[PDB]
Amino acid sequence: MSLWVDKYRPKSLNALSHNEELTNFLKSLSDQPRDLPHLLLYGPNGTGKKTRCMALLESIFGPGVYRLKIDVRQFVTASNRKLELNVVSSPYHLEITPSDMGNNDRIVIQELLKEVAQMEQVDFQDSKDGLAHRYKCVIINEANSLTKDAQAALRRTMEKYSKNIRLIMVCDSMSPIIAPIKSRCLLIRCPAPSDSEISTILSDVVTNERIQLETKDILKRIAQASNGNLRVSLLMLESMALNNELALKSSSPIIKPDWIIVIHKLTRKIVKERSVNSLIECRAVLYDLLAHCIPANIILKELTFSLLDVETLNTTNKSSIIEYSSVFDERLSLGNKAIFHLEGFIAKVMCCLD
Amino acid sequence: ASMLEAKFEEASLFKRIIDGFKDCVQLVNFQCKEDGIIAQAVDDSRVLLVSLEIGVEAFQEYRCDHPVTLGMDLTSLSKILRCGNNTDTLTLIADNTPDSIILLFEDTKKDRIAEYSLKLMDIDADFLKIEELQYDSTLSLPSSEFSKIVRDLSQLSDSINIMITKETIKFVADGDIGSGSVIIKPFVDMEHPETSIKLEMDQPVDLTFGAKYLLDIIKGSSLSDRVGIRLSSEAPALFQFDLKSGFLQFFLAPKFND
Amino acid sequence: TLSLQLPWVEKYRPQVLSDIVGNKETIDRLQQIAKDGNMPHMIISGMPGIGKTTSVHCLAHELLGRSYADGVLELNASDDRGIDVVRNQIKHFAQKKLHLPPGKHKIVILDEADSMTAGAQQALRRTMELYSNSTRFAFACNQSNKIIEPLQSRCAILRYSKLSDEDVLKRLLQIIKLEDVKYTNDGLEAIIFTAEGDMRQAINNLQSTVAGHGLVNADNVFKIVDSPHPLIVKKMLLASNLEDSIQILRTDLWKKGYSSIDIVTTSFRVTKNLAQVKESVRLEMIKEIGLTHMRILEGVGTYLQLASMLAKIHKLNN
Amino acid sequence: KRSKENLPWVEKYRPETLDEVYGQNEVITTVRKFVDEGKLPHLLFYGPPGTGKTSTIVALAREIYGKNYSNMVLELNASDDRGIDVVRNQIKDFASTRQIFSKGFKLIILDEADAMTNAAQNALRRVIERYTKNTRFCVLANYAHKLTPALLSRCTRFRFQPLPQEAIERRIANVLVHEKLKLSPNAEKALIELSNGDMRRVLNVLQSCKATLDNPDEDEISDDVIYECCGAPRPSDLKAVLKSILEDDWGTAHYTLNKVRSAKGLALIDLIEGIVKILEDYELQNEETRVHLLTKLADIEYSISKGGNDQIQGSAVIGAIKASFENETV
Amino acid sequence: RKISKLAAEQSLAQQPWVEKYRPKNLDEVTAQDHAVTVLKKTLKSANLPHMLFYGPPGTGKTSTILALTKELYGPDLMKSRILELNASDERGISIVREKVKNFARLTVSKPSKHDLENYPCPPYKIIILDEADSMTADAQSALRRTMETYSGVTRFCLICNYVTRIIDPLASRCSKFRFKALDASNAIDRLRFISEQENVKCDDGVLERILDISAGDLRRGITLLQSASKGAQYLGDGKNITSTQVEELAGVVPHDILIEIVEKVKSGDFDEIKKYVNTFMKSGWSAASVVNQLHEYYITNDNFDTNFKNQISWLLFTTDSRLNNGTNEHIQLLNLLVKISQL
DNA sequence: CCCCCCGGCCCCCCCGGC
Numbered sequence A: 001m002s003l004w005v006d007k008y009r010p011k012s013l014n015a016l017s018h019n020e021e022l023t024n025f026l027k028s029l030s031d032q033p034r035d036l037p038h039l040l041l042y043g044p045n046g047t048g049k050k051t052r053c054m055a056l057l058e059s060i061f062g063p064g065v066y067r068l069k070i071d072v073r074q075f076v077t078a079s080n081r082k083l084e085l086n087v088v089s090s091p092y093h094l095e096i097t098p099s100d101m102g103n104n105d106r107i108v109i110q111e112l113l114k115e116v117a118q119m120e121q122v123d124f125q126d127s128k129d130g131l132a133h134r135y136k137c138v139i140i141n142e143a144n145s146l147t148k149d150a151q152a153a154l155r156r157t158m159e160k161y162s163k164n165i166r167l168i169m170v171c172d173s174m175s176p177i178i179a180p181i182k183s184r185c186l187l188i189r190c191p192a193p194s195d196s197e198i199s200t201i202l203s204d205v206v207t208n209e210r211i212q213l214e215t216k217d218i219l220k221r222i223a224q225a226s227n228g229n230l231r232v233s234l235l236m237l238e239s240m241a242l243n244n245e246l247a248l249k250s251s252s253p254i255i256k257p258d259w260i261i262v263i264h265k266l267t268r269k270i271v272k273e274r275s276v277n278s279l280i281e282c283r284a285v286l287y288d289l290l291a292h293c294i295p296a297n298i299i300l301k302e303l304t305f306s307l308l309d310v311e312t313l314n315t316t317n318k319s320s321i322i323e324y325s326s327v328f329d330e331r332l333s334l335g336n337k338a339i340f341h342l343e344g345f346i347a348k349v350m351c352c353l354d
Numbered sequence B: 001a002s003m004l005e006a007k008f009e010e011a012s013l014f015k016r017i018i019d020g021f022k023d024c025v026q027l028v029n030f031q032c033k034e035d036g037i038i039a040q041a042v043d044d045s046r047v048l049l050v051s052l053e054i055g056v057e058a059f060q061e062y063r064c065d066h067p068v069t070l071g072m073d074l075t076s077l078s079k080i081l082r083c084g085n086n087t088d089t090l091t092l093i094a095d096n097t098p099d100s101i102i103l104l105f106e107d108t109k110k111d112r113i114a115e116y117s118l119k120l121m122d123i124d125a126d127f128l129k130i131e132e133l134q135y136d137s138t139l140s141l142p143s144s145e146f147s148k149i150v151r152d153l154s155q156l157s158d159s160i161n162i163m164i165t166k167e168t169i170k171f172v173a174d175g176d177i178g179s180g181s182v183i184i185k186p187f188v189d190m191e192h193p194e195t196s197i198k199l200e201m202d203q204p205v206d207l208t209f210g211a212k213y214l215l216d217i218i219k220g221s222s223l224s225d226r227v228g229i230r231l232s233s234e235a236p237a238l239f240q241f242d243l244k245s246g247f248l249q250f251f252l253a254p255k256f257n258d
Numbered sequence C: 001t002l003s004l005q006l007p008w009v010e011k012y013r014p015q016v017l018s019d020i021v022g023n024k025e026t027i028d029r030l031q032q033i034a035k036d037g038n039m040p041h042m043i044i045s046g047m048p049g050i051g052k053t054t055s056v057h058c059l060a061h062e063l064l065g066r067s068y069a070d071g072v073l074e075l076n077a078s079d080d081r082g083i084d085v086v087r088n089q090i091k092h093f094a095q096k097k098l099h100l101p102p103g104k105h106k107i108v109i110l111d112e113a114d115s116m117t118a119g120a121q122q123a124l125r126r127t128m129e130l131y132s133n134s135t136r137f138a139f140a141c142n143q144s145n146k147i148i149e150p151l152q153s154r155c156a157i158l159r160y161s162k163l164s165d166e167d168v169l170k171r172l173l174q175i176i177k178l179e180d181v182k183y184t185n186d187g188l189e190a191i192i193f194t195a196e197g198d199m200r201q202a203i204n205n206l207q208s209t210v211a212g213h214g215l216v217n218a219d220n221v222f223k224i225v226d227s228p229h230p231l232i233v234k235k236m237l238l239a240s241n242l243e244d245s246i247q248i249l250r251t252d253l254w255k256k257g258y259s260s261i262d263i264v265t266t267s268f269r270v271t272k273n274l275a276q277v278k279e280s281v282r283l284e285m286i287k288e289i290g291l292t293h294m295r296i297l298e299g300v301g302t303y304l305q306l307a308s309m310l311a312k313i314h315k316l317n318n
Numbered sequence D: 001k002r003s004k005e006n007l008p009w010v011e012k013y014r015p016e017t018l019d020e021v022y023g024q025n026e027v028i029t030t031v032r033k034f035v036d037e038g039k040l041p042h043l044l045f046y047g048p049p050g051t052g053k054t055s056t057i058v059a060l061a062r063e064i065y066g067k068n069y070s071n072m073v074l075e076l077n078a079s080d081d082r083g084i085d086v087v088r089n090q091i092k093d094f095a096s097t098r099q100i101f102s103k104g105f106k107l108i109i110l111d112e113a114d115a116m117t118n119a120a121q122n123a124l125r126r127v128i129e130r131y132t133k134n135t136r137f138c139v140l141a142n143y144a145h146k147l148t149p150a151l152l153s154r155c156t157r158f159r160f161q162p163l164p165q166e167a168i169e170r171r172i173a174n175v176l177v178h179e180k181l182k183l184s185p186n187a188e189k190a191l192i193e194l195s196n197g198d199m200r201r202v203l204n205v206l207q208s209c210k211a212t213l214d215n216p217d218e219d220e221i222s223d224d225v226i227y228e229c230c231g232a233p234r235p236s237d238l239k240a241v242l243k244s245i246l247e248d249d250w251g252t253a254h255y256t257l258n259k260v261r262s263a264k265g266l267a268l269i270d271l272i273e274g275i276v277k278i279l280e281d282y283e284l285q286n287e288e289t290r291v292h293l294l295t296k297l298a299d300i301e302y303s304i305s306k307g308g309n310d311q312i313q314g315s316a317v318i319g320a321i322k323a324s325f326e327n328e329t330v
Numbered sequence E: 001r002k003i004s005k006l007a008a009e010q011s012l013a014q015q016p017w018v019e020k021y022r023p024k025n026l027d028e029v030t031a032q033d034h035a036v037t038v039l040k041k042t043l044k045s046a047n048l049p050h051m052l053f054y055g056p057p058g059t060g061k062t063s064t065i066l067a068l069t070k071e072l073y074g075p076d077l078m079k080s081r082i083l084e085l086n087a088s089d090e091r092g093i094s095i096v097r098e099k100v101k102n103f104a105r106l107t108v109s110k111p112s113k114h115d116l117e118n119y120p121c122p123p124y125k126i127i128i129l130d131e132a133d134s135m136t137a138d139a140q141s142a143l144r145r146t147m148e149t150y151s152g153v154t155r156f157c158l159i160c161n162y163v164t165r166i167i168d169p170l171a172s173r174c175s176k177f178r179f180k181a182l183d184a185s186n187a188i189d190r191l192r193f194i195s196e197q198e199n200v201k202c203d204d205g206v207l208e209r210i211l212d213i214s215a216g217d218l219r220r221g222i223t224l225l226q227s228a229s230k231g232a233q234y235l236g237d238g239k240n241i242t243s244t245q246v247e248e249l250a251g252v253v254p255h256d257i258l259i260e261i262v263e264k265v266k267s268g269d270f271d272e273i274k275k276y277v278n279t280f281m282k283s284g285w286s287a288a289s290v291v292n293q294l295h296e297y298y299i300t301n302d303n304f305d306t307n308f309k310n311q312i313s314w315l316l317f318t319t320d321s322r323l324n325n326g327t328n329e330h331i332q333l334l335n336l337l338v339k340i341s342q343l
Numbered sequence F: 001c002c003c004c005c006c007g008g009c010c011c012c013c014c015c016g017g018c
């Protein structure tokens, strides 16, 4: 049935179990939500930013926020192209991901958000204070992927129409967000859960799911391998239980994603052989990874941090590798074709290592 | 609704006047004074000048307390003027230092009122008084004949050359597919004086004009049955249509001979 | 005053092939064609202001005589030359019945044919072939590569080269003798130097100098025609010390009103053609100039950016 | 538009006659000689912003025709549509038709022609030539690289230089007389220094200064007023900052920079430009110093143009200057 | 169903403090006197020039222009006299050539007797192009002659954050106004007034710390103050807000973690630095704040020589420039720390 | 009352340095 990562997700602020200070701050924000400013939640991926945003929305409006529906909205470009945007909406809030339309995301800000903001709330949404709600929440997922034009278009909308809409933007890093937008939002840091908290959550899941654990050390190993990613930890616990007949032993191996294995193989290939033929072969692996929806930035990060973990490399090699990684990460951020920058980075690393 | 109030008993008159020269100019300054409304406008290419005059005798009622200037885009004015019907009285209304002009279409029999407002534009242009000129040749002919001649010759070429000599007027066109020449002579019919071709020639005249401008000028034939053409070798050609009270004049610059 | 003096470029425009200077072999071939006739389809290409349109018109006149009015169809960039025009007007002209001297044919002149669309050029292909017995086509262009290969295959090629200083001096002296212009040798040398092989520019500069100063000497000539900025940029890029390059930039370009974008574009163009410098060094200089140009296009058109570009160029050569 | 006194000073003082255009004596004299003798050629006016090209051509048109010049000249600019279709129809009929009012020649003024498409410029080539007997063309430009070589070959070029000091001083004196204002000598020097040869900047800054004075009648504009209204660093501030950077330690230099910038809220870019101007006159022993200074300061200016952290940028400026000046010893 | 419409005052009373305390008149602007005085003198001079407002975020440009328009035309005549276009509206060359030009050419709206008796009512309209730095160069060039030809009835205001993005002709045509950064020395009064009107109780120096953390942005300071007030009210303990709470809410790294990072850098071991940074990024600290704190610590430390500071300044500048382009924070921070450790 | 003609939005494809 539903995966344990989704079956046991908290649906309230009182159901949270890690980062109690963040829970207290969110509860303080929800005490008097009428003057709630725009929110920007930033933190490591897979820590529970979306879960906490949904919990805050539930506290402000009630459980009805969890009754979700999906619709489709049409848009027309200057070239007469027709684009479709999938909108997830509830009786109290609207969720959008403008980056789905790429460079056309600006239109989503210009038309859909403008239309929503230029409409006041007339439905009698009685609140805890006894008076009806006056604004509708908008969740912009993956705000870091928005183009600078869309962010610029977002500037005046949040100010002129602040009485009808309040924006909650969830991001993993604030570097791509332009300063004017960051100035208009309340920034909320979302630290990743500690290993002990992850182990507690996994043990609770095990107890509820009737899983035979030989020891509690397996949960600690799973938490340590997740690097603070709770979603990955839960999905790996589920994966490790379906390969051992729902019984986990102390010798159960940790399962890594296939793309991680491919990247480690590429790292070993680069380390062992430094040649033009090796670069040509690595180009095929890079193209293969990029053709299966593996982002280039993730590939670069994983390759850089796997090369730095090789025990046969000296300090100078690692310093050169990290410098080249920074330079080519900037190039990727300022470029279009990622394969070019990745191949350049691999060639420079091969040159430095040899 | 006090300063300027002018009533056309029939709204078709003003619409027809605008129809005559809306395709030649876009921005027009109408100056309304105690003696009526006067306007001039030069086209984008500075080749054609349109001068419209409407006297107080063409209005059922007219009251202009002080001189006023109204800058209007003829496209919007024409759009507004095609809303009223031919059986409604049309009132132009303006106030002191106005920013907009009010058009009132009234149907007393049905007790129906229509109000439109057109925003005025700040157009900086001076009323360039057209000094009177002694033209070498002056002719008058039915508007329909001139319109047909212009339409016929426009197909064969983009330029039409007019010759005025002793007791003969010639329109000539020469293009790629062929050439055409229409010759007319002075003539008067006592039974039907409206079809008479009248000519007064002091010196022979030979002037070439663009067909595109003549095709736009002939659109004023719906305001009068006869058209007057005054031509001179050292002055723009004047095409005049006489209204009941005022007039509509087109000054067209001849093409350089070379 | 409401009167205009006719420019000497028009008052003294050649009317016969014998009055055209430069490209002696091509002009002789044109005269031979005008003599025998049987004019073939031709495309005349060259740099601006060397006598292409003049040559085409002179040939058409010398070939058709009193029939020029009916036997010539001239179209240029200022006239509509779409596919519809080619399929209706040019076709009608080609199919027109016109009795001409024994060995003469109708002429369709397409000036500045390089600006035509590919559709019109494709449409002209069969029109030229089916009516070659009565009509011939003469194209005049600056970039022959913009004419589709099928059209080039059906036409002869006449490429015009730069006019030598001797031809420019000859024509300028003829005009001076026909205008009683007082001149000095250095003035004519300066006029030729600034003309850079362009007869139209030379004649215009001479007329402007005569009308503005009277005496055609070096001083007056340079008061009308400013020193070519590409040469100043070349001097700036070839300077030995960084201080000299910065002085050239500040005194000769920046304080004279030249824009930063113009300076960087001229620097790129000059560097691309600096054969004296090795190709690799020119490539590095081009990379630096491109970085500076990208910075300028983003809005930072400051003198500091140009100074930094010069410093980087000097560092490359050290 | 009630009165000319309601207009901005940049538009109120627009020259109406060729005698009111200052700092372009050569061009004005040449064009006047051409017009008087009836030998006006096709003209190109190339120059930087605010030098008097549009004003000069408008004055020339008014002199040739008179008060009704607007109805006798075809003026087009970037704000209007100037595609190939407009060239083929509007300009072509204007050039091939006689004047309605007088019997003189016709003038077409294509201002900001650098914004015109290549197709329109190519189409204008034969229009300029065929109708040269009765039509003349004027092309105004700020960037010559946007003009096709064919169009340039058909026009005689005139370069508008940055306004000299004397012309700016004379115009300032005229404005002071008109406005009943008093300007100090050092104030005039500072105003001219910050103008960079642009008259519009001078007029705007003077208008701002007048609004700053509590009593414009009995008060005089001093250098302090000019520096405060524009929010620009004073020469003393630049000298002190450079001296602290060049002779004091890191802590003292940082404190001095922050104190100087916080007293009047100075901008880092202005300080960098002033320090670059000051250092341009320095006699350095090694070219490496100049190369490092120029490259690092250009990089810092480019980074500032995109925002960034101001404190880090100031520290970078200090460190770059200190490191560059270390090459003057060995 | 339907809800009864709210009053303007009631609606404003429940808005975020940034919108609630937006300046209403030109006198409420805090630290822009050098330009506010010039703008105020135009209410009597009636010769407002073309304006180009530029400055860092949260300095009061939009507030200043809105207050100026409201004072010039009043609540009723403002709508017909103002045309506002921002980054959320289409602003191509076609729009400039048709919409902006058509509005500029229109005759000024006729003032009413009440407006003439109570407000200056200058004889021109205003076009406000907010975020003008986002417009293309061709569109900006299309405005050059429109600005000058119709200046008699129309005035232009261009508001931008990056002045370099405005083409030189437009900047020359516009009188330039630079909005200065709002720090603890020029904006303390406004923040104190806001806190007093909101009954916010804080210890001495809390407002100064908030303004220092804001780094020139008053909007950020007001938002942080509102967050602190909300937290204090939720706790309901009656105690004063403290600087540590403000730093925690602002995302400032604790000083102890900064000292640990400095010690790791001093050690110089690559593996230990990598491990510590991997653990550090799990807390979600923003790289920009870490870089700023490292700059503050190193540049103002007397235990370092001149060459070390010269090199670290350039290293920090390069890292900040790279981060400003939207790059991965982990890699850049690790590279910066490794480079510093090898100085 | 209805057919033919022919100007006017809409649409879609192709360049873009010199």
Ligand SMILES: Nc1ncnc2c1ncn2[C@@H]1O[C@H](COP(=O)(O)OP(=O)(O)OP(O)(O)=S)[C@@H](O)[C@H]1O
Binding pocket: C008, C009, C010, C012, C013, C014, C019, C020, C021, C022, C046, C047, C048, C049, C050, C051, C052, C053, C054, C055, C141, C142, C171, C199, C200, C203, D125, D150
């Ligand atoms: N070879 C030449 N001999 C004499 N005069 C010449 C010659 N070439 C050009 N000229 C003069 O320059 C004027 C312009 O020359 P054209 O041939 O019409 O221009 P062009 O060579 O067609 O340049 P493009 O490519 O059309 S812009 C002529 O009218 C002559 O006055």
Ligand SMILES: Nc1ncnc2c1ncn2[C@@H]1O[C@H](COP(=O)(O)OP(=O)(O)OP(O)(O)=S)[C@@H](O)[C@H]1O
Binding pocket: D009, D010, D011, D013, D014, D015, D020, D021, D022, D023, D024, D047, D048, D049, D050, D051, D052, D053, D054, D055, D056, D141, D142, D171, D199, D200, D203, E169, E172
């Ligand atoms: N030579 C000058 N003498 C006096 N005032 C001048 C002069 N040049 C410019 N000005 C002033 O600056 C204003 C603008 O001058 P313009 O000639 O329109 O600018 P410009 O030279 O056209 O700059 P561009 O190229 O259009 S950006 C004029 O109205 C004068 O007030």
Ligand SMILES: Nc1ncnc2c1ncn2[C@@H]1O[C@H](COP(=O)(O)OP(=O)(O)OP(O)(O)=S)[C@@H](O)[C@H]1O
Binding pocket: A180, A183, E017, E018, E019, E021, E022, E023, E028, E029, E030, E031, E032, E055, E056, E057, E058, E059, E060, E061, E062, E063, E064, E160, E161, E190, E218, E219, E222
């Ligand atoms: N000078 C100031 N005086 C008083 N409050 C100010 C000032 N500057 C900013 N604020 C506050 O910050 C809020 C936002 O100010 P804005 O003027 O909209 O920001 P901004 O200057 O436009 O920044 P950008 O350029 O649009 S990102 C206002 O509503 C005020 O609450």
Ligand SMILES: Nc1ncnc2c1ncn2[C@@H]1O[C@H](COP(=O)(O)OP(=O)(O)O)[C@@H](O)[C@H]1O
Binding pocket: A005, A006, A008, A009, A010, A015, A016, A017, A018, A044, A045, A046, A047, A048, A049, A050, A051, A052, A170, A201, A230, A231
């Ligand atoms: N407080 C919590 N208690 C239990 N599980 C949680 C908690 N917070 C997050 N999770 C789990 O972590 C997973 C990933 O969280 P997610 O909402 O993706 O965080 P982010 O939005 O930062 O990626 C979710 O599937 C959820 O089940």
Ligand SMILES: [Mg+2]
Binding pocket: C053, C111, D126, D129
């Ligand atoms: Mg030609």
Ligand SMILES: [Mg+2]
Binding pocket: D053, D054, D055, D111
């Ligand atoms: Mg100009």
Ligand SMILES: [Mg+2]
Binding pocket: E061, E062
């Ligand atoms: Mg703003």
